[PDB]
Amino acid sequence: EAPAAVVTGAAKRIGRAIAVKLHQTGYRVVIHYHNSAEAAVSLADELNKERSNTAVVCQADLTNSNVLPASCEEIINSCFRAFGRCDVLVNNASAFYPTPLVGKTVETQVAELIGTNAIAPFLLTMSFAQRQSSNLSIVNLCDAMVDQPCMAFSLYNMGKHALVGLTQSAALELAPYGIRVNGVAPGVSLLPVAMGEEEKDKWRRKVPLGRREASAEQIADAVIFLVSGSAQYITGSIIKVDGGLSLVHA
Amino acid sequence: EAPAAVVTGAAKRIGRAIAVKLHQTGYRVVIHYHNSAEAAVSLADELNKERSNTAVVCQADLTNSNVLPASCEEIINSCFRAFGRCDVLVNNASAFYPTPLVGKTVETQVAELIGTNAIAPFLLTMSFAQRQKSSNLSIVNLCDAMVDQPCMAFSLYNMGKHALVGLTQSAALELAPYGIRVNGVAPGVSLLPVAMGEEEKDKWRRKVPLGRREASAEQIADAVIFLVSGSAQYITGSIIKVDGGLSLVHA
Amino acid sequence: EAPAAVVTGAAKRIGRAIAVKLHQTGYRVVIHYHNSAEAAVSLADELNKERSNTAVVCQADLTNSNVLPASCEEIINSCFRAFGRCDVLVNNASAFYPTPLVQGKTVETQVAELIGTNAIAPFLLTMSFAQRQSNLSIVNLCDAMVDQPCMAFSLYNMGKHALVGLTQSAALELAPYGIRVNGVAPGVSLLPVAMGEEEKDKWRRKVPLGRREASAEQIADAVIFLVSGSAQYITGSIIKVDGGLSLVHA
Amino acid sequence: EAPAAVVTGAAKRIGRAIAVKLHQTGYRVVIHYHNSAEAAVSLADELNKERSNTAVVCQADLTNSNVLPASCEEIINSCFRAFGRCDVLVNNASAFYPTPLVGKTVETQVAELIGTNAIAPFLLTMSFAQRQSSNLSIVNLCDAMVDQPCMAFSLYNMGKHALVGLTQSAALELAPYGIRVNGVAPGVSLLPVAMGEEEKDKWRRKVPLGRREASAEQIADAVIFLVSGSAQYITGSIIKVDGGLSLVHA
Ligand SMILES: NC(=O)c1ccc[n+]([C@@H]2O[C@H](COP(=O)([O-])OP(=O)(O)OC[C@H]3O[C@@H](n4cnc5c(N)ncnc54)[C@H](OP(=O)(O)O)[C@@H]3O)[C@@H](O)[C@H]2O)c1
Ligand SMILES: NC(=O)c1ccc[n+]([C@@H]2O[C@H](COP(=O)([O-])OP(=O)(O)OC[C@H]3O[C@@H](n4cnc5c(N)ncnc54)[C@H](OP(=O)(O)O)[C@@H]3O)[C@@H](O)[C@H]2O)c1
Ligand SMILES: NC(=O)c1ccc[n+]([C@@H]2O[C@H](COP(=O)([O-])OP(=O)(O)OC[C@H]3O[C@@H](n4cnc5c(N)ncnc54)[C@H](OP(=O)(O)O)[C@@H]3O)[C@@H](O)[C@H]2O)c1
Ligand SMILES: NC(=O)c1ccc[n+]([C@@H]2O[C@H](COP(=O)([O-])OP(=O)(O)OC[C@H]3O[C@@H](n4cnc5c(N)ncnc54)[C@H](OP(=O)(O)O)[C@@H]3O)[C@@H](O)[C@H]2O)c1
Ligand SMILES: Nc1nc2[nH]c(-c3ccc(Br)cc3)c(-c3ccccc3)c2c(=O)[nH]1
Ligand SMILES: Nc1nc2[nH]c(-c3ccc(Br)cc3)c(-c3ccccc3)c2c(=O)[nH]1
Ligand SMILES: Nc1nc2[nH]c(-c3ccc(Br)cc3)c(-c3ccccc3)c2c(=O)[nH]1
Ligand SMILES: Nc1nc2[nH]c(-c3ccc(Br)cc3)c(-c3ccccc3)c2c(=O)[nH]1
């Protein structure tokens, strides 16, 4: 029988390429999404046409709130409902936008940025572990530039830093149960859709290895590695997939 | 004119030492507290006896909520109403208890652990900076030397502290044009809880290479004083471990 | 044309496992050795029995000296001589013994062996590899406990820290050449043969994931990943393969 | 009776500022130098005019060699000969120049860059500990950009990384003797004397805090803090003095 994986924010971009790769490797997949229903449903279609009954979608808002624990429990429950098991959780979903220190409210910014990048991954990891020959692991999508952050992205960056803490804390605490917890940290990969083309080339130009961004597929490749049987002693590790960007001084 | 500092969680232990040392250095102080009113007030009284009109208290819950931004704005405001200025912010208040992965609800634990250790520091930072829109302005965040070697089953506390490292760095960067520095002090094991059995206290003490003892609160305060001083005027984004070598010790 | 790899200190233990796995993946290999000639040759025998003329041996002392550059140049030359190309360099060879700061070999000899094997030779090999020039990369065998070092092992530890520096400096500088430079950081893997059985279990008990050491093969798996096409955007990354050991406080 | 300190490379620039501030704080000082004899004795003259018999010079090459240990022993011996004690060691002396991976032989480059930045600090630390109310400590002059290194400076950067490892290893090992071991990490401070003003300004403009370099005194201030009784629990800590430079992305 085929293992199953939850991938959050899996309708588009890196999350999508992660879901695809997991599926190609043999996994059944829960494709989580928030707003991107059309793209999510379309992906499940593609996957299931390849292998029958191997993908479902699951809608949820991962903003922090008093119901987030229930929403995260339900995402994991949805994997068990479809597939009878849940072997892999990928925390990929992420809000990303500036929150300068000097008309969404600040309480909403805090809820979205810290919810998606950190609180939801924690709650998802909690529900994953509680619901548990096997190779169980979590992969968090981190940030190679977590210590060289974007100007005015302090809440986003606080979420990402918290996610490093979670990766490590959960690696430690869940090791006795055979669950591995690891990270994959992009630098510059798929550029924001809203970003103008000049700012895009500015980012590309900073990357030592080839002066270009990572493909989504290259990011997924590192995910696939950490969930595989070639990573069975790896836990609490965060692999940069950044073409050396984090090594470049100002 | 004497400069002024807000210290959060200043009624007791490390925050108290910090407020006292800042006061001794010449600061006027806002002693923020949550539940420890009597201790906060007894410290304000002690300090006002040293120099009249140099210490006020300010009560607030720093748990994450819809009212937290207003609370933090009001803590900053309190310093201005009291003293005409706000030169130093020390983010010291912190909830600390286990939250294992496998009576409070988890959403409450999130609110308390992430709110005290991380979001309230961010909101305080915004309000501090907004009000400042040869002075020596800075923020010091109380971090954790053991942030990458966490206590078992403290994932939320640890997430909070990690987030605080990110804030320290993101704020250093963003506020540098305003001349506001932002740094941390990262204690290892300090002032152990009076109620912890001495036998449990000694298990921790025995791990510390430098003197096989915990840091005093005053030792933690000494690093804060350095960071706020004119001797640290090019230092920003730096987190100073004050840990007796504990973090260098493998399992 | 199969690609070709150099693995230093490849006669035994982790380096052996690395050469074997590389070979199984389709590489031709240079098995470098210092003292273990008999073991180097029986490995080459085994490998060339699977596939004729795909394994050669190469002897060198990697102690720092006036001749070390020439020796390192020649290790690279041997790969080009045997196989016409050099795709991968694995810096595995390492001296490891205590050098107490407060009070056999002179201190200057200790400096030479510990800093030479763990840092200077890797630098010189890196120079010669890059000079002599597809999916080219280098993988340095690091130390997950580089920041929580063994007591009285300051020279070894300085060497491994230097090797971090080299990993990152060389990733930056050789990215324009398409040469990726990465590391693999074991925590507790194969225990030193000299170690007493009870001390061995003292170390095993520290590891959260399984209370045991990584096998050499598990270390090698991370090496294989980094040299593969599935790591083509990864450079300057050091992957811990430590079972969570570096996460554990005193 | 007044404490005594050894400062390596103390004839000028940051080591001179350190010597001066230690002296102002009441230390007697050994001003080590290599080539800058005139500057060294000019400094000791000023200091001795301030308080007589409180400064001496001490010449030594800190390039790695088989006599380097004797040379480092003699530097420490010199402090005891002049002042009857040695309370503080500041490892400031450093060679700094490029060593491209693709004048001096490589053997010499290795000896100078690794000897000054790491091996001599190790040996001086051994000698300092061996010769030993008190507040004993060592401060190593590190590099805030140790993980975002200058292009083509691999040997220098290897040296500085090793120095991080020594700082940590030695803090651990010497803590039972009550000797603290810490570091101070400039980012951009006094620009190299051969730099033209234009290239100077290029480095200045990178610094968030003030778009300028740290003064020599600003670095010394962090040293004096670490040696002071205000840092009596600090060991194994490296204090960046970089105006935010290491936090700035490419
Ligand atoms: N792209 C990069 O270069 C880069 C760099 C560093 C790190 N990363 C990390 O890599 C991961 C993937 O990056 P990406 O660029 O593919 O991500 P992205 O496109 O910015 O976000 C991926 C998905 O997150 C979901 N999401 C946003 N807010 C949410 C909410 N409140 N509740 C639930 N879901 C929400 C969105 O889902 P819907 O579309 O369904 O609403 C979105 O499609 C992220 O964690 C990111 O932080 C990426
Ligand atoms: N002690 C250590 O060994 C150690 C180790 C690593 C890091 N640190 C860090 O150093 C700092 C000081 O440590 P500590 O041991 O002195 O702290 P602590 O005694 O655990 O807590 C300090 C104060 O935090 C305040 N606080 C707690 N929850 C709060 C809430 N919801 N809202 C507002 N305030 C709240 C409390 O104020 P009231 O009493 O007024 O309710 C308390 O007295 C903390 O940031 C801690 O994380 C300490
Ligand atoms: N084993 C672990 O748990 C562990 C933990 C952390 C890091 N690592 C790292 O992973 C790597 C592999 O570890 P390992 O335990 O397999 O290594 P090891 O057995 O300690 O040594 C590997 C080989 O290094 C070679 N070597 C030693 N001194 C040399 C010299 N002066 N010149 C040339 N070669 C020399 C020896 O080759 P000859 O036998 O041919 O003389 C030896 O067989 C090392 O880089 C190590 O530091 C290992
Ligand atoms: N300057 C900066 O902005 C900066 C940035 C990062 C880190 N740092 C670190 O802070 C420290 C001080 O920097 P700096 O710019 O003041 O240093 P520097 O001027 O580059 O060097 C200081 C002294 O090092 C001594 N030295 C060089 N080679 C030597 C050898 N073979 N043997 C013995 N001594 C030797 C020289 O002494 P003589 O002149 O007597 O020959 C020189 O005056 C260094 O460790 C540096 O790496 C500085
Ligand atoms: N969720 C989500 N998270 C993201 N984090 C980054 C990023 C990139 C660099 C630095 Br420094 C810090 C963060 C980007 C991004 C990707 C390309 C260009 C710019 C930003 C990005 C995104 O798009 N979506
Ligand atoms: N706010 C607050 N934060 C804290 N963090 C720690 C700490 C941090 C890292 C490790 Br690893 C272990 C404990 C302690 C602590 C330290 C020693 C004994 C009991 C508690 C502590 C505390 O008391 N109040
Ligand atoms: N070359 C070589 N390098 C080594 N480094 C470590 C090591 C492990 C832990 C800490 Br902390 C620091 C160093 C070991 C080792 C392996 C197993 C047990 C103990 C030490 C080891 C070895 O054998 N050969
Ligand atoms: N011994 C000595 N060591 C040094 N290290 C740095 C430095 C600074 C930044 C990066 Br990135 C890497 C290294 C400089 C320097 C100082 C100012 C401008 C440029 C370089 C410098 C020096 O001068 N003398």
Coordinates of N, CA and C in Angstrom, one line a residue, chain C residues 33-135:
Chain C
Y33 N 44.4 6.8 0.1 CA 44.8 6.2 1.4 C 46.2 6.7 1.8
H34 N 46.4 6.6 3.1 CA 47.7 7.0 3.7 C 48.4 5.7 4.1
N35 N 48.0 5.1 5.3 CA 48.5 3.9 5.8 C 47.8 2.6 5.4
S36 N 46.5 2.7 5.0 CA 45.7 1.5 4.7 C 45.8 1.0 3.3
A37 N 47.0 0.6 2.8 CA 47.2 0.2 1.4 C 46.4 -1.1 1.1
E38 N 46.6 -2.0 2.0 CA 46.0 -3.4 1.8 C 44.4 -3.3 1.7
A39 N 43.8 -2.5 2.6 CA 42.4 -2.2 2.5 C 42.0 -1.4 1.3
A40 N 42.8 -0.5 0.9 CA 42.5 0.3 -0.3 C 42.5 -0.6 -1.5
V41 N 43.5 -1.4 -1.6 CA 43.6 -2.4 -2.7 C 42.4 -3.4 -2.7
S42 N 42.1 -4.0 -1.6 CA 41.0 -5.0 -1.6 C 39.6 -4.3 -2.0
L43 N 39.5 -3.0 -1.6 CA 38.3 -2.3 -2.1 C 38.3 -2.2 -3.7
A44 N 39.5 -1.8 -4.2 CA 39.6 -1.5 -5.6 C 39.4 -2.9 -6.3
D45 N 39.9 -3.9 -5.7 CA 39.7 -5.3 -6.3 C 38.2 -5.5 -6.4
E46 N 37.5 -5.5 -5.3 CA 36.0 -5.7 -5.2 C 35.3 -4.8 -6.3
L47 N 35.6 -3.6 -6.4 CA 34.9 -2.7 -7.3 C 35.2 -3.0 -8.8
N48 N 36.5 -3.3 -9.1 CA 36.9 -3.6 -10.4 C 36.4 -5.0 -10.9
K49 N 36.2 -5.9 -9.9 CA 35.4 -7.1 -10.1 C 34.0 -6.9 -10.6
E50 N 33.3 -5.9 -10.0 CA 32.0 -5.6 -10.5 C 32.1 -5.0 -11.9
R51 N 32.9 -4.0 -12.1 CA 33.1 -3.3 -13.3 C 34.6 -3.0 -13.6
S52 N 35.1 -3.7 -14.6 CA 36.6 -3.7 -14.9 C 37.1 -2.2 -15.1
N53 N 38.3 -1.9 -14.6 CA 39.0 -0.6 -14.7 C 38.1 0.6 -14.3
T54 N 37.5 0.5 -13.2 CA 36.7 1.7 -12.7 C 37.1 2.1 -11.3
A55 N 38.1 1.5 -10.7 CA 38.6 1.8 -9.4 C 40.1 1.8 -9.4
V56 N 40.8 2.9 -9.0 CA 42.2 2.9 -8.8 C 42.5 3.4 -7.4
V57 N 43.7 3.1 -6.9 CA 44.2 3.7 -5.6 C 45.2 4.8 -5.7
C58 N 45.4 5.6 -4.7 CA 46.3 6.7 -4.7 C 46.7 7.0 -3.3
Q59 N 48.1 6.9 -3.1 CA 48.6 7.1 -1.7 C 49.1 8.5 -1.5
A60 N 48.7 9.1 -0.4 CA 49.3 10.4 0.1 C 49.2 10.6 1.5
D61 N 50.2 11.2 2.1 CA 50.1 11.8 3.4 C 49.4 13.2 3.3
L62 N 48.4 13.5 4.1 CA 47.8 14.8 3.9 C 48.1 15.8 5.1
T63 N 49.1 15.4 5.9 CA 49.7 16.3 6.9 C 50.2 17.6 6.2
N64 N 50.0 18.7 6.9 CA 50.5 19.9 6.3 C 52.1 19.9 6.2
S65 N 52.6 20.3 5.1 CA 54.1 20.4 4.8 C 54.3 21.2 3.6
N66 N 55.6 21.3 3.2 CA 56.1 22.0 2.0 C 55.7 21.2 0.7
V67 N 55.5 19.9 0.9 CA 55.1 19.1 -0.3 C 53.6 18.8 -0.4
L68 N 52.8 19.2 0.6 CA 51.4 18.9 0.5 C 50.8 19.5 -0.8
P69 N 51.1 20.7 -1.2 CA 50.5 21.1 -2.4 C 50.7 20.1 -3.6
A70 N 52.0 19.7 -3.7 CA 52.3 18.8 -4.8 C 51.5 17.5 -4.6
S71 N 51.5 16.9 -3.4 CA 50.7 15.7 -3.2 C 49.2 15.9 -3.6
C72 N 48.6 17.0 -3.3 CA 47.2 17.2 -3.6 C 47.0 17.4 -5.1
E73 N 47.9 18.1 -5.7 CA 47.9 18.2 -7.1 C 47.9 16.8 -7.7
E74 N 48.7 15.9 -7.1 CA 48.9 14.6 -7.8 C 47.7 13.7 -7.6
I75 N 47.0 13.9 -6.5 CA 45.8 13.1 -6.2 C 44.8 13.5 -7.3
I76 N 44.6 14.8 -7.6 CA 43.7 15.2 -8.7 C 44.3 14.6 -10.0
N77 N 45.6 14.7 -10.2 CA 46.1 14.2 -11.5 C 45.9 12.7 -11.7
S78 N 45.9 12.0 -10.6 CA 45.7 10.5 -10.7 C 44.3 10.2 -11.3
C79 N 43.3 11.0 -10.9 CA 41.9 10.8 -11.4 C 41.9 11.1 -12.9
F80 N 42.5 12.2 -13.3 CA 42.6 12.5 -14.8 C 43.4 11.5 -15.5
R81 N 44.4 10.9 -14.9 CA 45.2 9.9 -15.6 C 44.5 8.6 -15.7
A82 N 43.8 8.2 -14.7 CA 43.1 6.9 -14.7 C 41.9 7.0 -15.6
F83 N 41.2 8.1 -15.6 CA 39.8 8.2 -16.1 C 39.5 9.3 -17.1
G84 N 40.5 10.2 -17.3 CA 40.3 11.3 -18.3 C 39.4 12.5 -17.8
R85 N 39.0 12.4 -16.5 CA 38.1 13.5 -16.0 C 38.1 13.4 -14.5
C86 N 37.6 14.5 -13.9 CA 37.4 14.5 -12.4 C 36.1 15.3 -12.1
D87 N 35.0 14.6 -11.8 CA 33.7 15.2 -11.6 C 33.4 15.6 -10.1
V88 N 33.9 14.8 -9.2 CA 33.6 14.9 -7.8 C 34.8 14.7 -7.0
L89 N 34.9 15.5 -5.9 CA 36.0 15.4 -4.9 C 35.3 15.3 -3.6
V90 N 35.6 14.2 -2.8 CA 35.1 14.1 -1.5 C 36.2 14.1 -0.5
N91 N 36.2 15.2 0.4 CA 37.2 15.4 1.4 C 36.8 14.7 2.7
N92 N 37.3 13.5 2.8 CA 36.8 12.7 3.9 C 37.9 12.4 4.9
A93 N 39.2 12.2 4.4 CA 40.3 11.9 5.3 C 40.4 12.8 6.5
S94 N 40.7 12.3 7.6 CA 40.8 13.2 8.8 C 41.5 12.5 10.0
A95 N 42.4 13.3 10.6 CA 43.0 13.0 11.8 C 42.2 13.5 13.0
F96 N 42.1 12.7 14.1 CA 41.2 13.0 15.1 C 41.9 12.4 16.4
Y97 N 42.4 13.3 17.2 CA 42.9 12.9 18.5 C 42.9 14.1 19.4
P98 N 43.0 14.0 20.8 CA 43.0 15.1 21.6 C 44.3 15.9 21.6
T99 N 44.2 17.2 21.8 CA 45.3 18.1 22.0 C 45.0 19.1 23.1
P100 N 45.1 18.6 24.4 CA 44.8 19.4 25.6 C 45.5 20.7 25.6
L101 N 44.9 21.8 26.0 CA 45.5 23.1 26.0 C 46.5 23.2 27.2
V102 N 46.2 22.4 28.3 CA 47.0 22.5 29.5 C 47.5 21.1 29.8
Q103 N 48.8 21.0 30.3 CA 49.5 19.7 30.5 C 49.4 19.2 31.9
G104 N 55.2 10.8 22.4 CA 54.2 11.4 21.6 C 54.6 12.5 20.7
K105 N 53.7 13.2 20.1 CA 54.0 14.2 19.0 C 54.2 15.6 19.5
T106 N 55.1 16.3 18.9 CA 55.2 17.7 19.2 C 53.8 18.5 18.9
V107 N 53.6 19.6 19.5 CA 52.4 20.4 19.2 C 52.5 20.8 17.7
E108 N 53.6 21.1 17.1 CA 53.7 21.5 15.7 C 53.4 20.4 14.8
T109 N 53.6 19.2 15.2 CA 53.2 18.0 14.4 C 51.7 17.8 14.4
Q110 N 51.1 18.0 15.6 CA 49.7 17.9 15.9 C 49.0 19.0 15.0
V111 N 49.5 20.2 15.0 CA 49.0 21.2 14.2 C 49.0 20.8 12.7
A112 N 50.1 20.2 12.3 CA 50.3 19.8 10.9 C 49.3 18.7 10.5
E113 N 49.1 17.7 11.3 CA 48.2 16.6 10.9 C 46.7 17.0 11.0
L114 N 46.4 17.6 12.1 CA 45.0 17.9 12.4 C 44.4 19.0 11.6
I115 N 45.2 20.1 11.5 CA 44.8 21.2 10.6 C 45.1 20.8 9.1
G116 N 46.2 20.1 8.7 CA 46.3 19.6 7.4 C 45.3 18.7 6.8
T117 N 44.9 17.6 7.5 CA 44.0 16.7 7.0 C 42.6 17.3 6.9
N118 N 42.2 18.1 7.9 CA 40.8 18.5 8.1 C 40.5 19.8 7.3
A119 N 41.6 20.5 6.9 CA 41.4 21.8 6.3 C 42.3 22.3 5.2
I120 N 43.6 22.2 5.4 CA 44.6 22.6 4.4 C 44.6 21.7 3.1
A121 N 44.6 20.4 3.3 CA 44.6 19.5 2.2 C 43.2 19.7 1.5
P122 N 42.1 19.8 2.2 CA 40.9 20.0 1.4 C 41.0 21.3 0.6
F123 N 41.6 22.4 1.1 CA 41.8 23.6 0.4 C 42.6 23.4 -0.9
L124 N 43.7 22.6 -0.8 CA 44.7 22.4 -1.9 C 44.1 21.5 -2.9
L125 N 43.4 20.5 -2.5 CA 42.6 19.6 -3.4 C 41.5 20.4 -4.1
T126 N 40.9 21.3 -3.4 CA 39.9 22.1 -4.0 C 40.5 23.0 -5.1
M127 N 41.6 23.7 -4.8 CA 42.4 24.4 -5.8 C 42.7 23.6 -7.0
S128 N 43.4 22.5 -6.8 CA 43.8 21.6 -8.0 C 42.6 21.1 -8.8
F129 N 41.5 20.8 -8.1 CA 40.3 20.3 -8.7 C 39.7 21.4 -9.6
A130 N 39.7 22.6 -9.1 CA 39.0 23.7 -9.9 C 40.0 24.1 -11.0
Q131 N 41.3 24.1 -10.7 CA 42.3 24.5 -11.7 C 42.2 23.6 -13.0
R132 N 42.1 22.3 -12.8 CA 42.2 21.3 -13.8 C 40.9 21.2 -14.7
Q133 N 39.9 22.1 -14.5 CA 38.7 21.8 -15.2 C 38.8 22.3 -16.7
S134 N 27.5 18.5 -17.7 CA 28.4 18.2 -16.6 C 27.8 18.6 -15.2
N135 N 28.2 17.9 -14.1 CA 27.7 18.1 -12.8 C 28.9 17.9 -11.8

